[PDB]
Design an enzyme around this catalytic site. Structure first.
Site, short mmCIF file in Angstrom:
data_model
loop_
_atom_site.label_atom_id
_atom_site.label_comp_id
_atom_site.label_asym_id
_atom_site.label_seq_id
_atom_site.Cartn_x
_atom_site.Cartn_y
_atom_site.Cartn_z
N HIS F 62 0.82 -1.20 0.00
CA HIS F 62 0.00 0.00 0.00
C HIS F 62 0.86 1.25 0.00
N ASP F 92 9.79 19.89 -26.97
CA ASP F 92 9.77 18.66 -26.21
C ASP F 92 10.74 18.84 -25.05
N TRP F 127 7.44 0.22 4.80
CA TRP F 127 8.02 0.78 3.60
C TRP F 127 9.42 1.30 3.84
N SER F 157 13.98 5.77 -12.62
CA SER F 157 13.01 6.61 -13.33
C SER F 157 12.99 8.03 -12.80
N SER F 158 12.90 8.19 -11.49
CA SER F 158 12.80 9.52 -10.91
C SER F 158 14.12 10.26 -10.86
N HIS F 241 12.96 12.39 4.19
CA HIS F 241 12.25 13.67 4.28
C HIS F 241 12.28 14.47 2.97
N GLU F 243 12.02 13.14 0.17
CA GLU F 243 10.98 12.46 -0.59
C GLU F 243 9.61 13.03 -0.29
N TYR F 245 8.93 16.02 0.79
CA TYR F 245 8.76 17.36 0.23
C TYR F 245 8.67 17.34 -1.29
N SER F 256 -1.36 26.77 -6.57
CA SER F 256 -1.15 28.18 -6.89
C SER F 256 -1.67 28.53 -8.27
N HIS F 290 14.20 14.01 12.44
CA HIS F 290 13.00 14.08 13.24
C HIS F 290 12.21 12.80 13.17
N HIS F 291 12.61 11.88 12.31
CA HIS F 291 12.10 10.53 12.33
C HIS F 291 12.92 9.63 13.22
N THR F 316 6.08 27.55 4.62
CA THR F 316 4.77 26.98 4.37
C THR F 316 3.66 27.89 4.87
N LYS F 319 3.34 30.56 2.26
CA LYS F 319 2.58 30.07 1.11
C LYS F 319 1.09 30.02 1.40
N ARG F 438 1.59 1.64 15.79
CA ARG F 438 1.51 1.44 14.35
C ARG F 438 1.75 -0.01 13.97
C1 HEA Z 1 0.50 8.42 -1.12
C2 HEA Z 1 0.31 8.34 0.18
C3 HEA Z 1 -0.80 7.59 0.80
C4 HEA Z 1 -2.22 7.59 0.47
C5 HEA Z 1 -2.98 8.34 -0.58
C6 HEA Z 1 -2.74 6.65 1.48
C7 HEA Z 1 -4.17 6.36 1.54
C8 HEA Z 1 -4.86 5.52 2.52
N1 HEA Z 1 -4.19 4.84 3.47
FE1 HEA Z 1 -2.14 4.77 3.89
N2 HEA Z 1 -0.07 4.76 4.26
C9 HEA Z 1 0.88 5.46 3.64
C10 HEA Z 1 0.61 6.39 2.55
C11 HEA Z 1 -0.68 6.68 1.94
N3 HEA Z 1 -1.83 6.13 2.33
C12 HEA Z 1 2.26 5.24 4.11
C13 HEA Z 1 3.52 5.88 3.64
C14 HEA Z 1 2.08 4.26 5.18
C15 HEA Z 1 3.15 3.68 6.06
C16 HEA Z 1 3.36 2.21 5.84
C17 HEA Z 1 4.17 1.73 7.00
O1 HEA Z 1 3.75 1.95 8.15
O2 HEA Z 1 5.23 1.14 6.76
C18 HEA Z 1 0.62 4.05 5.17
C19 HEA Z 1 -0.05 3.13 6.07
C20 HEA Z 1 -1.48 3.13 6.27
C21 HEA Z 1 -2.09 2.86 7.59
C22 HEA Z 1 -1.39 2.58 8.87
C23 HEA Z 1 -1.43 1.07 8.97
C24 HEA Z 1 -0.13 0.58 9.51
O3 HEA Z 1 0.58 1.37 10.16
O4 HEA Z 1 0.18 -0.60 9.28
C25 HEA Z 1 -3.53 2.93 7.33
C26 HEA Z 1 -4.60 2.74 8.33
O5 HEA Z 1 -5.65 2.22 8.04
C27 HEA Z 1 -3.67 3.25 5.91
C28 HEA Z 1 -4.95 3.36 5.25
C29 HEA Z 1 -5.18 4.23 4.13
C30 HEA Z 1 -6.54 4.45 3.66
C31 HEA Z 1 -7.81 3.90 4.21
C32 HEA Z 1 -6.33 5.33 2.54
C33 HEA Z 1 -7.42 5.91 1.77
O6 HEA Z 1 -7.26 7.32 1.95
C34 HEA Z 1 -7.50 5.62 0.30
C35 HEA Z 1 -8.48 6.68 -0.19
C36 HEA Z 1 -7.71 7.50 -1.17
C37 HEA Z 1 -8.10 7.63 -2.42
C38 HEA Z 1 -9.38 6.99 -2.90
C39 HEA Z 1 -7.20 8.46 -3.29
C40 HEA Z 1 -7.68 8.60 -4.71
C41 HEA Z 1 -7.11 7.49 -5.54
C42 HEA Z 1 -6.41 7.74 -6.64
C43 HEA Z 1 -5.91 6.58 -7.41
C44 HEA Z 1 -6.15 9.14 -7.12
C45 HEA Z 1 -6.46 9.14 -8.60
C46 HEA Z 1 -6.52 10.52 -9.18
C47 HEA Z 1 -5.84 10.81 -10.29
C48 HEA Z 1 -4.97 9.79 -10.97
C49 HEA Z 1 -5.93 12.17 -10.86
N4 HEA Z 1 -2.42 3.31 5.18
C1 HEA Z 2 3.21 15.18 2.17
C2 HEA Z 2 4.37 15.01 2.75
C3 HEA Z 2 4.63 15.57 4.09
C4 HEA Z 2 4.63 16.97 4.46
C5 HEA Z 2 4.37 18.21 3.65
C6 HEA Z 2 4.96 16.86 5.88
C7 HEA Z 2 5.05 18.07 6.69
C8 HEA Z 2 5.62 18.19 8.03
N1 HEA Z 2 5.87 17.12 8.80
FE1 HEA Z 2 5.60 15.08 8.34
N2 HEA Z 2 5.59 13.07 7.75
C9 HEA Z 2 5.40 12.56 6.53
C10 HEA Z 2 5.09 13.38 5.37
C11 HEA Z 2 4.96 14.84 5.31
N3 HEA Z 2 5.14 15.63 6.38
C12 HEA Z 2 5.49 11.09 6.42
C13 HEA Z 2 5.26 10.25 5.19
C14 HEA Z 2 5.76 10.68 7.80
C15 HEA Z 2 5.96 9.34 8.44
C16 HEA Z 2 7.07 8.52 7.85
C17 HEA Z 2 7.00 7.18 8.51
O1 HEA Z 2 7.27 7.12 9.73
O2 HEA Z 2 6.68 6.19 7.83
C18 HEA Z 2 5.80 11.97 8.49
C19 HEA Z 2 6.06 12.05 9.91
C20 HEA Z 2 6.57 13.26 10.50
C21 HEA Z 2 7.52 13.22 11.62
C22 HEA Z 2 8.15 12.00 12.23
C23 HEA Z 2 7.38 11.67 13.49
C24 HEA Z 2 7.60 10.22 13.78
O3 HEA Z 2 7.75 9.44 12.83
O4 HEA Z 2 7.64 9.85 14.97
C25 HEA Z 2 7.71 14.63 11.95
C26 HEA Z 2 8.62 15.08 13.01
O5 HEA Z 2 8.89 16.24 13.21
C27 HEA Z 2 6.90 15.42 11.02
C28 HEA Z 2 6.76 16.86 11.05
C29 HEA Z 2 6.37 17.67 9.90
C30 HEA Z 2 6.44 19.13 9.95
C31 HEA Z 2 6.93 20.00 11.06
C32 HEA Z 2 5.92 19.50 8.64
C33 HEA Z 2 5.78 20.86 8.11
O6 HEA Z 2 6.37 20.93 6.81
C34 HEA Z 2 4.33 21.30 8.04
C35 HEA Z 2 4.29 22.79 7.79
C36 HEA Z 2 2.87 23.31 7.73
C37 HEA Z 2 2.34 24.00 8.74
C38 HEA Z 2 3.13 24.25 9.97
C39 HEA Z 2 0.92 24.50 8.69
C40 HEA Z 2 0.75 25.80 7.93
C41 HEA Z 2 1.43 26.97 8.58
C42 HEA Z 2 0.79 27.97 9.18
C43 HEA Z 2 -0.70 27.99 9.24
C44 HEA Z 2 1.59 29.09 9.80
C45 HEA Z 2 1.35 29.18 11.30
C46 HEA Z 2 1.73 27.88 11.96
C47 HEA Z 2 2.79 27.80 12.77
C48 HEA Z 2 3.66 28.99 13.02
C49 HEA Z 2 3.13 26.49 13.42
N4 HEA Z 2 6.05 14.58 10.18
CU LIG Z 3 9.91 14.12 7.72
#
Ligand code: HEA
Ligand code: HEA
Ligand SMILES: [Cu+2]
Ligand SMILES: CCCCCCCCCCCCCCCC(=O)OC[C@H](COP(=O)([O-])OCC[N+](C)(C)C)OC(=O)CCCCCCCCCCCCCCC
Ligand SMILES: CCCCCCCCCCCCCCCC(=O)OC[C@H](COP(=O)(O)OCCN)OC(=O)CCCCCCCCCCCCCCC
Ligand SMILES: CCCCCCCCCCCCCCCC(=O)OC[C@H](COP(=O)(O)OCCN)OC(=O)CCCCCCCCCCCCCCC
Ligand SMILES: CCCCCCCCCCCCCCCC(=O)OC[C@H](COP(=O)(O)OCCN)OC(=O)CCCCCCCCCCCCCCC
Ligand SMILES: CCCCCCCCCCCCCCCC(=O)OC[C@H](COP(=O)(O)OCCN)OC(=O)CCCCCCCCCCCCCCC
Ligand SMILES: CCCCCCCCCCCCCCCC(=O)OC[C@H](COP(=O)(O)OCCN)OC(=O)CCCCCCCCCCCCCCC
Ligand SMILES: CCCCCCCCCCCCCCCC(=O)OC[C@H](COP(=O)(O)OCCN)OC(=O)CCCCCCCCCCCCCCC
Ligand SMILES: CCCCCCCCCCCCCCCC(=O)OC[C@H](COP(=O)(O)OCCN)OC(=O)CCCCCCCCCCCCCCC
Ligand SMILES: CCCCCCCCCCCCCCCC(=O)OC[C@H](COP(=O)(O)OCCN)OC(=O)CCCCCCCCCCCCCCC
Ligand SMILES: CCCCCCCCCCCCCCCC(=O)OC[C@H](COP(=O)(O)OCCN)OC(=O)CCCCCCCCCCCCCCC
Ligand code: CUA
Ligand SMILES: [Ca+2]
Ligand SMILES: [Mg+2]
Lengths: 67, 59, 55, 45, 102, 534, 51, 269, 236
Positions: F62, F92, F127, F157-158, F241, F243, F245, F256, F290-291, F316, F319, F438
């Site tokens: 997933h 192109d 993952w 690819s990427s 991280h 990835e 962003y 935008s 931070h992970h 952010t 933005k 988890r």
């Molecule tokens: C791309 C990021 C992404 C998205 C979209 C989702 C979507 C969903 N995910 Fe998950 N998930 C992860 C990234 C994501 N997830 C990651 C990184 C983990 C960690 C694995 C790990 O712990 O190792 C995780 C693990 C995770 C957990 C934690 C389980 C665990 O820790 O073992 C759960 C809980 O139920 C969950 C459920 C879901 C559900 C119900 C949706 C639903 O939201 C699905 C509904 C979403 C849609 C229907 C989206 C539309 C579908 C499309 C295909 C878009 C098409 C559009 C165009 C092509 C224009 N996934």
């Molecule tokens: C879509 C990708 C995405 C984005 C954009 C972010 C955005 C951020 N994430 Fe997240 N994060 C993940 C994807 C992402 N994350 C994934 C996939 C994991 C789990 C990986 C795994 O364990 O499998 C994760 C888990 C994760 C962790 C690890 C925790 C843990 O595993 O135990 C942390 C730790 O600091 C973190 C923090 C943040 C912060 C501070 C931002 C910031 O960039 C957010 C900034 C936005 C705002 C702050 C809100 C808007 C701002 C305002 C309204 C201004 C006023 C607000 C303030 C002044 C606070 N997130």
């Molecule tokens: Cu991170």
């Protein structure tokens, strides 16, 4: 225009109802036997233990959520 | 031995695809398709034994 | 005359930002002084009655 | 000059109902799990 | 723009005087009502005469609909309608509310 | 037919192959999430007869499918390869055979990931494939090797597409377009390609190290031998991280564009948005631990990492305040991309605020490996990037397909996914703050109450996905009739208030990018003579 | 190569002039994708004796 | 030139590449390589013939791709100035990606060496490991790399200066010095005490210098194809971009070998 | 001490670390709710007063005197939420004069505890393995996936130092109401401290994916008074 807000209100409520119904119909395909702990008597007998051990004093300790 | 103008006059005045325009292209391209055709389908034949769990004979 | 009617988006965004900070303030102040400072008091009256149950 | 009704009246009579509408939309957007807990058996009702 | 209100009116008076067709008078009217000020009565008058020169009647109605949407009150709208009444009755354009009464 | 699609060398065809693969793999990942969430609906074994290994394999599939096979090939692979040449006026991309192999190495990663599932037990490791679980002692067999090769082919690819993008927008811009006069989506793909180029090497190094540890008796992360798995955590998350962003920055560009064209006013401070995106990309390399707040670092390590993870809330925030400022004072035309953009602007900020709750290592000891983290990232993923992906589809689909979609069905689909995603991912914070860990297939019985409502919301989300499939079918079959009847929005900008309906007809499209001026479905040779810009 | 322009020529699949219905190709393209984890589940449950 | 005749050309300087089979052929070769090595690593395939066939198909398909690139650049005249600038920028981004791979490997070495384990003995290099001394053969390996750069520099500038024999001979000396370095690395790897299985030291050491070894054997290959194309008059005095990329490649392999030298052989002994 | 059904808050604290973690979380959530109320109020009022606006103010692009304000104001709210976080971070790390050490070694799907201080009259190290009670042998009233056959017993009002490691894969010694979360990696020894303020029993679980028995790996800590701890340790 002219009653499409009503259409995309009825469609949302219809989608919610269809999702609830199909969720029920595939919950009917799960394991026929829930665990033994998910009845009222087991959860009262666990809150027995938690009251004896002073668990979660200012919040709550009670585990009963089933019938 | 500086054949580059003579080869320009072949590669530009040609109808065939670019990997076929050299005169010696039939010597490269015909073996390669056979070697490629066995190289891509022989692991796909071993995929079902890897699913079932049958290891190959070594002893 | 007709005096100049200017700057309505200026005072509009000023009152909107002030109102947004005040609504966030009343939500957060309810959070603190009504949920957090109830959980704290239910905790600390338990600790103060424990410190007299131990005489 | 300041022709017409005051700006505090003009914008209060616009901003007052939208405060209440925002309160309703925010509480249904955040407090929707309270509606599930109220009907759950864990409340013992 | 660090523009004063008077530079705005003197810019848009001569901007309305140099429009030459229906695209240009509607364009200039659009980007003079797209500011954070209701235009002065003089530039609305210049807009009415400009829509008279291009010979389009619904733009001279949409001018008043636009300043109805643009003013803060209905008494500011009625103040515009007071001393813009002479030019409006001279050109002979109707307001939209009296043309399509609800 | 074989030369246009197998031997392909134009970017607009490789983009729709990317899009077909992305939506196929998204159906796969959504099915996997439906199985996960259906098993998690109630305590005890429900649908998989015990067998927690199969649960873990499905979680791996997933995550990997939805990240590396839906969001990256959808956003970067489809939208970048389609739109960045059209928005910089390039004929192109530079290096087009590279651009074709960067697609065709993705079905091969897909088939090796699927047979990774079908061999001995699958790779159930998360993952983030951590050793020593991902080693040869704890995972015997070819499962993890094939998963590592799936990651290798996706990284190939990427990386090739990133090189392609960097060179084609530094070199093939049309003849009035300086770098300051770029569209925001081009800056998104640009900064994303640099993050890819700088981050994918360390991932490839780490998982090749893991593969050699598994198969070649070498000891990078084997403790009996001198290794350390914290080295794997560092080398992984230095990619991990950047990835995430990478996943969000093209979403920022799509939002935008959408917000400005449906507010009918330009973006408030565009160059500060470019600076903010570049600052997010630069600062994303400084926050990777931070992970790793729990693994046993120093206190000054964790103090710096809370500081650096905290100071990415500033760009952010710039933005998001700029998006609110560019909808303030507008003329909002509530179409489906605008609905998706407003939902982005709400739900992404909620995910970011839980992110700054997680940024404090003082507090992350209460939330690490809980469902709170799952709530944060599924907010900013399936409501940030998926909502911007849906916005990009509903924003560009009738232009680049030539066929309009049903507007009422699109809004029904939006409201269903906006309801359903909230119902899945909002109770996960409650579960995580009460201590639910988890990656568990079964939980204590006290966690049943929010798990049930989450898996009810899962069916709403997949029902809206099925509705989206029907919307695609209705667009492909009846898309020429949707222009004729009133089932669709034909013009995404209404006339201005004094603009006549006939004066609108000579200037039907009013855009700040070339994409909406082209012929519908755009020509195989767009830009024979080059476009020109003052 | 000079390729055809138009409305339906940008997609690798055929929509309009077909001897089979298009919904066959369309919904069987997505049902296979929705059905890969079920094939996965079936073979990893038959390997573990649950069936 | 007239409008009628200007209209028979491209109006923009960029290469519109003809459709080509080698992307999908190399993709299927990478598939066969992955699926062959993941099954020979675990015994589901008897011998290494499938992996050998897959690597051979991969190499020959890359060779046919490069043959088509040579054909486009020389026999069709498709590489204008903008295309040259783009190819140079793409190769620079490529070598930045590979420098970052080496930075990950240096991170692995440093994380093992900055504070080592207790299972090696709080020691670096670990106990029992007989480290390679930096004075004997790796000093000659630094010398024949700093000299190979000096040869390829005059070979390049004599290619620009109109000389033919002074450029071909310098390219030949560069190629032979690179294969001298590769055979000296083979001799060191044979007469080395520790192996790649001898703990984390052998792991990080052979990982770094073996990745450098693989880059050097590809460097010898591209120096050979540059000699072929210079002898057969493909390379010209103003348009030699594959040669320029090879020069960039030599001069980055030189500096990363120096970092490998001073880290793996001086600081880490 | 134990999760409750439909809960939405932390478990009830038992150490000063967890009671500080709760206060820092609430202090962060204060300003977070301020910012959420601000942006949700703007997002409501903008689309409810400009959806029906037919003239767009298309010349508002710069805003110089307020871009600096919404750059500066997030920074000072980061400073305000970062002031107590650093204090808690540099308070929770010191393990100063503990009265007890306990080692916890995570094997694959059991924990192994080891009191190693030789304060006994036996003078030998105390170790035992604590397995999950399986679902078929749960006697009535026991908590599923939480109860174990043996328990970790700790005195109250005592600075305890948990030294945590593993044996084969990475585990996580985690108890939320005590507020300890510490990764057990098979190479190294981490430490945390605690001071238990109230007697009771506190549950936790392995919060790191160990494999196929990851859900079946719980922690159970009985905190008793020091006489009862001594009489427990006199046997095992
Ligand atoms: C791309 C990021 C992404 C998205 C979209 C989702 C979507 C969903 N995910 Fe998950 N998930 C992860 C990234 C994501 N997830 C990651 C990184 C983990 C960690 C694995 C790990 O712990 O190792 C995780 C693990 C995770 C957990 C934690 C389980 C665990 O820790 O073992 C759960 C809980 O139920 C969950 C459920 C879901 C559900 C119900 C949706 C639903 O939201 C699905 C509904 C979403 C849609 C229907 C989206 C539309 C579908 C499309 C295909 C878009 C098409 C559009 C165009 C092509 C224009 N996934
Ligand atoms: C879509 C990708 C995405 C984005 C954009 C972010 C955005 C951020 N994430 Fe997240 N994060 C993940 C994807 C992402 N994350 C994934 C996939 C994991 C789990 C990986 C795994 O364990 O499998 C994760 C888990 C994760 C962790 C690890 C925790 C843990 O595993 O135990 C942390 C730790 O600091 C973190 C923090 C943040 C912060 C501070 C931002 C910031 O960039 C957010 C900034 C936005 C705002 C702050 C809100 C808007 C701002 C305002 C309204 C201004 C006023 C607000 C303030 C002044 C606070 N997130
Ligand atoms: Cu991170
Ligand atoms: C239309 C189709 C016709 C109706 C189909 C539903 C039939 C039905 O009665 O469903 C029962 C479910 C109970 O589902 P369960 O609690 O998971 O038990 C299922 C059976 N086991 C697993 C024990 C074997 O009950 C439920 O599903 C309760 C969930 C309902 C979700 C919506 C509730 C709020 C509605 C407003
Ligand atoms: C359970 C049911 C839940 C609702 C489902 C049905 C809804 C149908 C609505 C409809 O269909 O409304 C159609 C109306 C337009 O009406 P009009 O003025 O053009 O009417 C003209 C004459 N008929 O768009 C609206 O709603 C206006 C508001 C749209 C805002 C959408 C934003 C997306 C959500 C973002 C999250 C909110 C963030 C802010 C919160 C603080
Ligand atoms: C899987 C997708 C789940 C379905 C969600 C999208 C479908 C929207 C259909 C809709 O929105 O139906 C709402 C409309 C509103 O009627 P109307 O005023 O448009 O009537 C004009 C004539 N059509 O009912 C209908 O027309 C037909 C009745 C539908 C009810 C069928 C099921 C009965 C219970
Ligand atoms: C933000 C506000 C969120 C709305 C919460 C609705 C509660 C539904 C309910 O009703 O929750 C029921 C629970 C369980 O009830 P009980 O065990 O007290 O029952 C005993 C008496 N019947 O109540 C609670 O314990 C807490 C109630 C208040 C919750 C406020 C704190 C919420 C946690 C904040 C962190 C989570 C959000 C993360 C960021 C998005
Ligand atoms: C916004 C839309 C949200 C839709 C999903 C709601 C899930 C409801 C649920 O999951 O219902 C579970 C609860 C409690 O059930 P239980 O724990 O007693 O039984 C467990 C075994 N079935 O039943 C109800 O509250 C029924 C009333 C639902 C009211 C919803 C109100 C939403 C506003
Ligand atoms: C990692 C794979 C190697 C990438 C090299 C990129 C060089 C940049 C460049 O300059 O690429 C230029 C050429 C591609 O040119 P083209 O045919 O796309 O351009 C047309 C203009 N003549 O590179 C290549 O032949 C790359 C060959 C890679 C073979 C697959 C290896 C997979 C591992
Ligand atoms: C049972 C499932 C739900 C049925 C919905 C009934 C709609 C009632 C009706 O018949 O609705 C009539 C309308 C008329 O359509 P209109 O908007 O053109 O007219 C507007 C009139 N004012 O059709 C619709 O809008 C809804 C059509 C969508 C139906 C969804 C199809 C099923 C989607 C899921 C299956 C496909 C994916 C599966 C493959 C993985
Ligand atoms: C792709 C991008 C990611 C790259 C990540 C790092 C790649 C490492 C390259 C490995 C080369 C190691 C090597 O060449 O080591 C040489 C070793 C043999 O030497 P020995 O120990 O027998 O000699 C010492 C005797 N006295 O060969 C191996 O046993 C492994 C061969 C396969 C490597 C792949
Ligand atoms: C695997 C073996 C790698 C050997 C590469 C040799 C490249 C030969 C093709 C060539 O040299 O292409 C010649 C062209 C330009 O030719 P020119 O303008 O100099 O011709 C002059 C005519 N007057 O250079 C390029 O496109 C760039 C080559 C970059 C190749 C990088 C490949 C990296 C692969 C990593 C995996
Ligand atoms: C504490 C900060 C929190 C910020 C929260 C973010 C809110 C985002 C949504 C609201 C954005 C408003 C639109 C952008 C501002 C704008 O329109 O700027 C364009 C004009 C500048 O143009 P001028 O030269 O004509 O005015 C000359 C006057 N300098 O400035 C304004 O009219 C508003 C000025 C606001 C003054 C500070 C108010 C702070 C309270
Ligand atoms: Cu031990 Cu998970
Ligand atoms: Ca379950
Ligand atoms: Mg962890």
């Amino acid at each position: 225009g002219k009653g499409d807000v009503a259409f995309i209100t009825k469609g949302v409520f219809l989608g919610l109802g269809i999702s609830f119904g199909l969720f029920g119909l595939v919950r009917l395909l799960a394991n026929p036997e829930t665990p033994k702990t998910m009845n009222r008597e087991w959860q009262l007998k666990s809150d027995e233990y938690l009251k004896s051990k002073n668990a979660n004093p200012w919040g709550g300790y009670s585990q009963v959520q089933s019938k | 031995a500086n054949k580059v103008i003579q080869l320009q006059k072949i590669f530009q005045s040609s109808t065939k695809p670019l990997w076929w325009r050299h005169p010696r292209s039939a010597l490269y391209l015909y073996p390669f398709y056979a070697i490629f055709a066995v190289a891509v389908v022989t692991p796909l034949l071993y995929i079902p034994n890897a699913i079932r769990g049958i290891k190959a004979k070594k002893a | 005359t007709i005096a100049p009617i200017t700057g309505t988006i200026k005072r509009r965004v000023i009152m909107d930002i002030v109102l947004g900070f005040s609504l966030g303030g009343v939500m957060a102040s309810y959070w603190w002084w009504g949920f957090h400072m109830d959980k704290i008091n239910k905790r600390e009256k338990f600790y103060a009655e424990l410190a007299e149950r131990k005489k | 000059g300041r022709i017409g009704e005051s700006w505090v009246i003009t914008e209060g009579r616009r901003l007052i109902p939208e405060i209440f509408q925002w309160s309703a939309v925010l509480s249904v957007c955040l407090g929707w799990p309270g509606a599930v807990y109220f009907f759950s058996k864990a409340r013992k009702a | 723009d660090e523009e004063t209100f008077e530079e705005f009116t003197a810019r848009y008076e001569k901007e309305f005087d140099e429009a030459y067709d229906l695209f240009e008078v509607q364009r200039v009217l659009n980007n003079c009502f797209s500011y954070d000020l209701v235009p002065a009565p003089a530039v609305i008058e210049k807009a009415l005469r400009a829509a008279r020169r291009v010979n389009d009647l619904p733009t001279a109605i949409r001018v008043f609909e636009a300043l109805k949407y643009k003013v803060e009150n209905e008494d500011q709208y009625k103040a515009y309608l007071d001393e813009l009444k002479d030019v409006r009755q001279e050109l002979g354009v109707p307001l939209k509310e009296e043309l399509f009464p609800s | 037919m074989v030369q246009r699609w197998l031997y392909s060398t134009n970017a607009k065809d490789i983009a729709v192959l990317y899009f077909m693969l992305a939506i196929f793999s998204g159906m796969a990942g959504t099915a996997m999430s439906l199985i996960i969430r259906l098993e998690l609906a109630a305590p005890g074994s429900q649908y998989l007869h015990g067998n927690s290994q199969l649960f873990n394999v499905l979680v791996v599939g997933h995550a990997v499918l939805m990240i590396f096979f839906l969001v990256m090939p959808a956003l970067i692979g489809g939208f970048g390869n389609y739109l960045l040449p059209l928005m910089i006026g390039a004929t192109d991309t530079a290096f087009p055979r590279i651009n074709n192999i960067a697609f065709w190495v993705l079905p091969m990663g897909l088939v090796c990931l699927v047979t990774s599932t079908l061999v001995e037990s699958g790779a159930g490791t998360g993952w983030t494939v951590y050793p020593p679980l991902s080693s040869i002692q704890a995972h015997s067999g070819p499962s993890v090797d094939l998963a590592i090769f799936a990651l290798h082919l996706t990284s190939i690819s990427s990386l090739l597409g990133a090189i392609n993008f960097i060179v084609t927008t530094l070199n093939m811009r049309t003849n009035g377009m300086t770098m300051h006069k770029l569209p925001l989506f081009v800056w998104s793909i640009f900064i994303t390609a640099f993050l890819l180029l700088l981050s994918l090497p360390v991932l490839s190094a780490g998982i090749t190290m893991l593969l050699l540890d598994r198969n070649f008796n070498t000891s990078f992360f084997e403790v009996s031998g001198g290794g350390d798995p914290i080295l794997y955590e560092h080398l992984f998350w230095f990619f991990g991280h950047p990835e995430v962003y990478i996943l969000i920055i093209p979403g920022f560009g799509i939002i935008s564009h959408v917000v400005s064209t449906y507010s009918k006013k330009p973006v408030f401070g565009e160059i500060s948005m470019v600076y903010a995106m570049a600052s997010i990309g630069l600062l994303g390399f400084l926050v990777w631990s931070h992970h790793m707040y729990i693994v046993g670092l120093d206190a000054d390590t964790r103090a710096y990492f809370t500081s650096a993870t905290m100071i990415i809330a500033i760009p952010t925030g710039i933005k998001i305040f700029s998006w609110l400022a560019t909808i303030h004072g507008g003329s909002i035309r509530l179409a489906t991309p605008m609905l998706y953009a407003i939902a982005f602007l709400f739900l992404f900020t909620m995910g970011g605020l839980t992110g700054v709750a997680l940024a404090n290592a003082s507090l992350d000891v209460a939330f690490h490996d809980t469902y709170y983290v799952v709530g944060h990232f599924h907010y900013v993923l399936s409501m940030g990037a998926i909502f911007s992906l849906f916005a990009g589809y509903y924003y560009w689909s009738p232009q680049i397909l030539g066929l309009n979609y049903n507007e009422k069905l699109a809004q029904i689909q939006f409201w269903l996914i906006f309801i359903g995603a909230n119902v899945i991912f909002f109770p996960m914070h409650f579960l995580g703050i009460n201590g639910m860990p988890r990656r568990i297939p079964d939980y204590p019985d006290a966690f049943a109450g929010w798990n049930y409502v989450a898996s009810i919301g899962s069916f709403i989300a997949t029902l809206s996905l099925f509705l989206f499939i029907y919307i695609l079918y209705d667009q492909l079959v009846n898309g020429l009739n949707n222009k004729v009847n009133n089932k669709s929005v034909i013009y995404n900008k209404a006339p201005d208030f004094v603009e006549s309906n006939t004066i609108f007809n000579l200037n039907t499209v009013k855009s700040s990018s070339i994409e909406f001026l082209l012929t519908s479905p755009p020509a195989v040779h767009s830009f024979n003579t080059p476009a020109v810009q003052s | 190569v000079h390729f055809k322009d138009g409305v339906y020529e940008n997609i690798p699949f055929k929509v309009k002039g077909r001897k089979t219905p298009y919904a066959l190709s369309h919904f069987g393209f997505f049902a296979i994708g929705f059905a890969v984890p079920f094939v996965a589940c079936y073979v990893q449950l038959k390997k573990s004796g649950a069936f | 030139m007239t409008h009628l005749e200007r209209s028979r050309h491209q109006q923009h300087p960029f290469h519109m590449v003809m459709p080509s089979p080698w992307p999908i052929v190399v993709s299927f070769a990478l598939l066969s390589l992955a699926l062959s090595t993941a099954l020979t690593m675990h015994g589901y395939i008897g011998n290494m013939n499938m992996v050998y066939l897959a690597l051979f198909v991969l190499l020959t398909s890359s060779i046919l791709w490069f043959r088509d690139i040579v054909a486009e650049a020389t026999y069709l005249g498709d590489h204008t100035m903008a295309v040259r600038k783009g190819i140079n920028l793409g190769f620079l981004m490529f070598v930045l990606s590979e420098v970052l791979i080496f930075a990950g490997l240096f991170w692995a070495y440093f994380h093992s060496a900055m504070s080592p384990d207790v299972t090696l003995g709080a020691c670096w290099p670990p106990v029992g490991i007989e480290a390679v001394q930096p004075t004997e053969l790796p000093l000659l390996n630094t010398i024949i790399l700093l000299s190979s750069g000096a040869t390829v520099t005059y070979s390049h500038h004599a290619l620009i200066a109109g000389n033919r024999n002074k450029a071909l001979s310098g390219l030949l000396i560069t190629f032979w010095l690179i294969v001298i370095f590769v055979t000296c690395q083979y001799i060191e790897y044979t007469n080395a005490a520790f192996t790649i299985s001898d703990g984390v030291y052998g792991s990080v050491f052979y990982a770094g210098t073996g990745l450098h070894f693989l880059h050097m054997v590809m460097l010898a290959a591209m120096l050979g194809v540059n000699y072929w194309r210079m002898r057969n008059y493909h390379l010209t005095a103003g348009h030699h971009v594959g040669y320029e990329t090879t020069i960039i490649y030599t001069h980055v392999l030189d500096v990363i070998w120096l970092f490998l030298y001073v880290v793996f052989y001086w600081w880490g002994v | 001490d134990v999760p409750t059904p439909y809960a939405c808050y932390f478990q009830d604290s038992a150490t000063p670390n967890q009671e500080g973690i709760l206060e820092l979380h609430d202090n962060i959530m204060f300003y977070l709710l301020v910012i959420l109320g601000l942006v949700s109020w703007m997002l409501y009022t903008i689309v409810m007063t400009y959806s029906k606006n037919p003239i767009a103010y298309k010349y508002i692009k710069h805003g110089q005197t307020i871009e600096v304000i919404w750059t500066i104001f997030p920074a000072v709210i980061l400073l305000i939420i970062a002031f107590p976080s650093f204090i808690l971070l540099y308070l929770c790390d010191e393990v100063i004069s503990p009265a007890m050490t306990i080692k916890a070694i995570g094997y694959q799907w059991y924990w192994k505890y080891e009191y190693s201080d030789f304060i006994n009259d036996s003078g030998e190290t105390v170790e035992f393995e604590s397995y999950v009670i399986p679902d078929e042998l749960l006697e009535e009233g026991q908590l599923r996936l939480l109860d174990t056959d043996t328990s970790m017993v700790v005195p109250v009002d005592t600075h305890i130092r948990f030294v945590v490691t593993a044996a084969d894969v990475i585990h996580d010694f985690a108890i939320p109401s005590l507020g300890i979360k510490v990764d057990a990696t098979p190479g190294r020894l981490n430490q945390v401290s605690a001071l238990i303020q109230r007697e009771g029993v506190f549950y936790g679980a392995c919060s790191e994916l160990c494999g196929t028995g990851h859900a079946n790996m719980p922690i159970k800590i009985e905190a008793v008074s020091l006489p009862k701890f001594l009489e427990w340790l006199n046997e095992q």
